[PDB]
Every structure is written in structure tokens, then in C-alpha cells.
Copies of this chain bind each other. A is one copy, B any other.
Amino acid sequence: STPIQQLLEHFLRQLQRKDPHGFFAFPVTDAIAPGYSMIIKHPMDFGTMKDKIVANEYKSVTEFKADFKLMCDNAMTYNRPDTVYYKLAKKILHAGFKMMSKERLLALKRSMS
């Protein structure tokens, strides 16, 4: 493993801790969600993200954050605001952007010296 894979595994672990039930842990199949595939064209979930970390597909924290955002944006588009899925997506999104803020990453860069 590389140091960047470890850092991303850390962020992913901390995010998934906020989805106890695993709503975001696996892909959304049409069996689970009728016609999902008709609405959401670029699906994403935590499991796909872990596989990309293992394949060493992320060049940057920015790329990881873009997948994370896409996953949350999907959930807030497929699901109405009054759902558990929409509300948790929104909570998750904010937590992730605090965790991986420019300010947090600058302070981490300084500690890499």
C-alpha cells in the first residue's frame, strides 16, 4: 500500500462510520430501488470507492472527494427530502467536506514536512 491509499482508506472508514445501516455501502440495484438506473446515470457508493482505492485509481484527494460528492448528490436526486436516504446523504456530504476541507488538508500537508 502507499501512503495515499492509507489516507483515503482512513477518510472512507470515517465516513462509513456515519452510515451504520449501510445504505451507501453497496450499489443501488433496481431490485432494491425500482427504476433507479433510469434516473441515476453515474452511480456511486462506498464499496465502489474502496475498490478504486485498492486499484490505486485516485491520484488526489480531490478525485476521491468528487466520487464522494457524486454518491451524495445521486441520493439527494433520486430520493425526496422527506426520506431517510435524502437526509443521511445531506448529513454525510457535510461531514465529508468538513473532514477533507482545504484548511484540514493544508494542515496535513504542513505535518508531512
A contact residues vs B (CB 8 Å cutoff): 17-20, 29, 51, 54-57, 82, 91
State A71–B49 Cα separation when bound (angstroms). 24
Give 11 A-B contacts (CB < 8 Å), ordered by A residue.
Answer: A17-B55, A17-B56, A17-B57, A18-B55, A18-B57, A19-B55, A20-B54, A20-B55, A20-B56, A29-B82, A51-B91
Copies of this chain in the oligomer: 2
Give complex CA distance A45, B18 in Å. 17
| In the bound complex, CA of A19 to CA of B29 (Å) | 22
Minimum CB–CB distance from A108 to chain B (whole Å) comes to 21
Q: How far is the CA of A56 from the CA of B17 in the complex (A)?
A: 8
Contacts of A29 in B (CB 8 A): 82
Residue of chain B at shortest CB distance from A19: B55
Q: In whole angstroms, how far apart are the Cα atoms of A48 and B19 in the complex?
A: 13
When distances are taken between beta carbons in the complex, the residues of chain B under 8 Å from A82 are 29
| B-side contacts of A17, CB under 8 Å | 55-57
User: Whole-angstrom distance between the alpha carbons of A51 and B20 in the complex?
Assistant: 9
**Chain B residues within 8 Å of A18, by CB:** 55, 57
